[model samples]
Target: NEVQETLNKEVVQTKNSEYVQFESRSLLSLFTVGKIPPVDAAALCYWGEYDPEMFDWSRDYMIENIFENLPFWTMIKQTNWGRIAIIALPRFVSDLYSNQDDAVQVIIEALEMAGIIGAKFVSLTGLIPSATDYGLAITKAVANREDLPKITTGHRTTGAAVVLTIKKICEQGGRDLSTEKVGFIGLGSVGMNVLPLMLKCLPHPQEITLCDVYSKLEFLENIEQNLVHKFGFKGKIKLALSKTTVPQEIYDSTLIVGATNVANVLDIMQVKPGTLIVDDSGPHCFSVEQAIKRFQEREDILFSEGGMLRSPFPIKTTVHLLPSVEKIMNNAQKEAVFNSNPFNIMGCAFSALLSSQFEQLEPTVGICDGEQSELHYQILQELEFEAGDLHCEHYVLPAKSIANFRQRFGKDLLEHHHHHH
Candidate 1:
């Protein structure tokens, strides 16, 4: 019965545009011929003003075949005028363009094809660094980009949330600014960016301990200088070149900010009782299971997964980029369609989300539907979640939907849904 349905579906002819009608048989023929005959390479072309009729056909064909099969050998052909395609099974290829304009032209064509075919969001799955990295990059890029309009007032809300979280944590401990000790682990990009923000909260700890595996003396010196220059702080700040060498006395510090890329760090079990640990290293920096276990064993300690604070933002611009980072990940199941050998579906997803967010469109939230979902599941099953098991929670709503979300979710949503465990 399934075979008959498949055959019947494959035989259906559908009008694409005024000039084109894509028959299922023709699509099957294209796949069969493209796979078997194998020309030098195939080029998929894309052009401006995508026709809805053509886009529908392209979307159906892609969801049915390309995404499902992920054939790595098929060559895509794209052009500014329109999209065209010729297929050559498999080989490494590079464009001949030398100039940035030409390079951009090629990207535009490819993006346009992906966009028209409803594959653009998925296309970026393999192009990002890590979800956190993508977020950092996007944040920095957008923050610095003078050409783009100022970000909407939504950012202020996110910032306010951060301030509130910090305030709540401090109030819970009943710790005063001058008496509390603060320790900072990792001094990388996110950590550096967060330091000033933390200082701005007016929490003057008795001593600040900075630890990093790398020689971050220069970075620390710069940070100190900036603090002194911007907001006069004469207190001594200790910088530790190694995490292991951090003084035991500082372990009793009221606040510990773990922001490094150190592996299996939670295994050490060094934090003191009553310490408030803010893990801002995204998913890569801490082990959720170990942290939770420690928190369970030691009721005096408090640990908050920092990733949740940034969850309201989009994936690409959020602090965690692993969902978007591209590294060499291969899936045999995907070998049937994608033209790239080492495909990064997560990166594709990240890029797609970024594109959607930038374009002010609805972002694809989950795996594909139907056969495409099966294919995506198979392709992603082998991929390991690199970051720790810390779960992030948040609510997303459209521009005008904020009040609705608050009304529906309630004003104190966190308190209502407060299950720390």
Candidate 2:
């Protein structure tokens, strides 16, 4: 009951390092109690660590009882990431803390609590522009323990996957990337890494344009010294900071990345009538209206929130629907053009959960990549939008608890035999 009380508190901290156990029912209660409206709020739930002591430990329990939320939420998943629990308040709530140190400490405790539940992987769900790096650093201290799941950043995978998908599509669409300019806005975690990842998956762009804040002098200088200076490129790269009429290179660019915080960006961007744009953040990166504005262009421009709408690994997972859990994701997919919805992002983690199987591997972060990339893909050949196609939802906790949930639905709702190898 003491831990139960802590779990329900507006915010909590683990006073000491001790393992804590969570039941399927209790975690579900916690999610329901902290009901965030779907539109305006996002939740971070720990899949809870897998326990050999606990049978059937791989199933995930991640739904909130409040089905009344209105805002759309997106998730980014990783493996360091694995065999562990996760918990989070919506961005709005966590934003209350301005002090980076305090935010970092809060994240450290959050990671510790999730670990108590045997969370091998700690996922920081909410959006904290300033806190990601601090949160990541804090995890290293916690991960110093050899058996724990290493901390992995969600933005890295999501950002890189999205950019790679775009590159794949452009080439398929008959555009030569070397001739077209690509622009990335804001070099936060996602943007900062996209260029590097591009080196692995894409050919050179005609040019790369970036927009970073002048006020973040230290950050700007750091990147200038570390990233901008050392990076090698065959194409030209430039920065856009002056807030007047958009820089010609940026506007002329064929690819646009809203790589930082997304939303209400219309006033700041300038583009040729038809340019591909990705709202490149936790979904809802661009408003429906703004997305529509970009969508009505010449058929070449692409718009989407999904990272790997076209990966082989993600596709396999979605095609096999898990009944009750997938209905919501099924509905979410009905509304996107890129067929790259946030549900797909969240759904992959469900498929990648080799939790109890985590004990199957030694605790190490350097050798990670357990994701099933063969299944990720942009669904349907329609080339514009893929809708009405059903995708599986994330399953709930407790080995026996999930077994019954499947029976009640009369469908093998939880597909735990998925592969991470």
Candidate 3:
């Protein structure tokens, strides 16, 4: 109860969960960055509730320097500097739920207060709400409010970030994602979320191998076919059914990621040099012993620890009113917090929000796709975060084409690519 109270300190619920309330304080009353949004963007938002229990990235805002922050540093020449205003950060209830069609709608229901309050955007913490309903909410929310409150999330951006990071690693080693094979282990929200996106990004691997213990292959099969057809990708996707294939999946590809719930699943002993392994899983896909041995044995072997998935550079963020989200949990939207530091992730989210508003763009409400991909990529470059296609910026399927895809893939269009026993 003591722990609960500490967490619940700021929580407030009203009208049968109909209303959620929480207030946010700015780290600095006013601040400014010249480019991207730049110009007196105002207010340094730290994070959700600033729980000391949260570690690392969540521990504190990027409080180092308003002068050295990526936002202004990247846009030095282009920005018309010296704008100022301490803007009120936003707040809302959240990711809502996951892995369900109703995911988006449920969260949309919670946005009334956020929308009414002139929030710039409601963060989809999870990002996988139902499309039809969630999309409509975005249309209504953005269309209705000129003040620019919109629904957005870091899911796609983080997914894109992961792939972008991998692409960078390979290029540094004189490797090519297009020619080299890639493997993704476990297809929970994060892995599944990042998969198609990887497909859309550059160096389209000649082959992609995916493994999931619970989900079936057909669902993913449809995706594979769709991706190939849409992108004209020559590579094929392979699914690993047996446990042994897990290692084989690692060996078969040059870039492998463990985006699963459990940790230390990869065979460090079996690792090959120059192969990139990224573990975004929180419980951790690799153990300290595993990482140490793999690296102590040789620095040539690449292992990227996963925590603090990032969005495009020159970002912005926010906070809110409602039930203290401390105790709030999404049973279905259940990925362990990848970044222990909510403050940092929230900081990144804050960066994204401010950029979107200043650019007069719709916040990234849903997943990465045609326009969304374009919007984010443009920001990455404009902010000088990345110059060329940093491997994850290409477009995916267009929004209008999804229905045609559903018709072709059968009714299970939105179902998990699970194996039906």
Candidate 4:
């Protein structure tokens, strides 16, 4: 019955999806590298809502009219390992979601271009995987072709980063996981991959509420069994099949992991005060307005960027919103909170650089398993990649911020543990 539903969905998307045509001209100057950089690795990206304004209207107007659209090879990073190409699809999240057929074709063409330009390793970034079924569609689309670059989705590593971030938070707060309650709001790739790692790394929280839409209940059931049998998780398990409701168990949780792809799926205000949230979602489960409100009124709360990494090497990029877009972003208060640091890169981009160096760090298509995620985390740690600072948006959250939260919220938790010790 579920298989039939999936088939219907497939049929419907194919029937309704439209292909957008592009003109083939010398418009590569507008969307791609003029002279291809000597590179073996590339990170395929998209125009995220808050992505830096990469073009001025003077030159961008040409491409807007040409209709010869191509993913732009916007920047190149020279690492001691090698130079990595940073490519962006000339589409926004809305365009990709609304026009999957067109977006998928463009991604395939981009992969072909990556191969033509000698990229041996290609990393899919932003919501590209989200558009491509966590990159499964792209892999299947190019399976018969040998000339295409080896593709990867850094989602497992991104999940590992989230786990590591949580571990750091637990450490700094001096909170005992065995006594604390934790909630996982998304059960997709990153959320699933994070579960076992969180179970293993932390001392095993007292209770966990796994929440997702009802359609995913079957998928969640298997993970629930694995949580109980494979990982031997002894904690109380509560399942919330509804995506909208904030369940009691979740609200009571002191630590929460927000990894839903859906925008603002969970209300930040609904959770208990003093809760620490680690969000790695593309459109955060909690809106930027929610984040700012909490930041201003609730010093006891902490929300950190769970899907970013601070690399040891310089990536050579700067991000600033356009004046017009800046007004909208600032209206949402994201401009003030969004990270503008030039040194950091997305987790998938980091994974692409790593894939250029290591062979065992396999590509994540539909989902990456717990053991593979663990290995990925180990590889990253060995190379000194870490969640350097508690990043709230694009800014480095100060130690003082954590200390402030610790003093106000974690005081009793820490004192209880101290007394127990």
TM-score of each: 0.42, 0.52, 0.50, 0.79
* RMSD of each candidate relative to the true structure: 17.1, 16.9, 15.8, 12.4
Q: Please list the residue runs of candidate 2 whose C-alpha ends up more than 4 Å from where it truly belongs after superposition.
A: 1-113, 140-149, 216-231, 243-249, 266-270, 283-286, 293-300, 306-343, 346-421
Alpha carbon lDDT at 50, candidate 1 = 24
Candidate 1 vs candidate 3: the TM-score winner is 3
lDDT of each: 0.36, 0.40, 0.42, 0.69
Compared with the true structure, what per-residue lDDT tens digits does model 4 show for residues 207-228? 8888888888888888889989
Best by lDDT: 4
Model 3 is weakest, by summed lDDT over 10 consecutive residues, at 69-78
Write down the lDDT that model 1 would get.
Answer: 0.36
Candidate 2, poorest ten consecutive residues by summed lDDT: 387-396
**Candidate 3 Cα lDDT to native:** 0.42
What ordering of candidates by lDDT runs from best to worst? Answer: 4, 3, 2, 1
lDDT of 3 by residue, 185-292 (tens): 876545654666566666578788877663566766765676678666677778664352355555666578777655567776665444566655444565646555
Q: What tens-digit string does per-residue lDDT give for candidate 1 at 1-421?
A: 4796565335322212222232323322454556322221122211112243633435435334433322222222221112223211111112211233332333333433333333323221211122213223333444453432221112111122223344445544444555556777765533553455556545656677777655667877776686667645556677666654454544645567665544445433665445566664334344566555554454445555442222211121101101111112123322222222111112222223233334442222221111122222222123321111122211111223323323323222322432311
What is the clash count of model 1?
Answer: 47
How far off is residue 211 in model 2, in Å?
1.7
RMSD of 3: 15.8
